[PDB]
Amino acid sequence: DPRYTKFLTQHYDAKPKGRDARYCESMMRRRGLTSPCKEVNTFIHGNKGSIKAICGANGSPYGENLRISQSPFQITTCKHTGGSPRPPCRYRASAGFRHVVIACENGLPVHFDESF
Numbered sequence: 001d002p003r004y005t006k007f008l009t010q011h012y013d014a015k016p017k018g019r020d021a022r023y024c025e026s027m028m029r030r031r032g033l034t035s036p037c038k039e040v041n042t043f044i045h046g047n048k049g050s051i052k053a054i055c056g057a058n059g060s061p062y063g064e065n066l067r068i069s070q071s072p073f074q075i076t077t078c079k080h081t082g083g084s085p086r087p088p089c090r091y092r093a094s095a096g097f098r099h100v101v102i103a104c105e106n107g108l109p110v111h112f113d114e115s116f
């Protein structure tokens with residue numbers, strides 16, 4: 001499913017080389033999120049399967065149609081800083097360890113909720 005592949009491109013990095021602004025600015029460019037600068041974007045780390053599992057076993061309902069993880073994840077949230085959102089895109093990083101909320105379709109993650 002292309003929506004799942006997009007989710008992984010935008011929101012999955014198994015073993016991050018960093019958790020800092022340097023990491024964010026690199027990752028936002030490498031994952032195609034700087035044309036123009038995406039304002040807020042979270043990367044989830046660790047095992048791919050456990051993220052998928054949020055759609056089923058490792059997850060629970062979360063209104064409206066969203067789902068929250070049963071376990072916490074290491075994450076890195078990249079937040080745009082500077083001025084107007086044209087490259088080169090500058091980011092500040094917030095490393096976290098918490099439960100995440102996603103939207104699922106066909107038992108696959110398609111959407112990451114950035115409301116935290």
Ligand SMILES: [Zn+2]
Nearest residue numbers: 039080081085
């Ligand atoms: Zn901005």
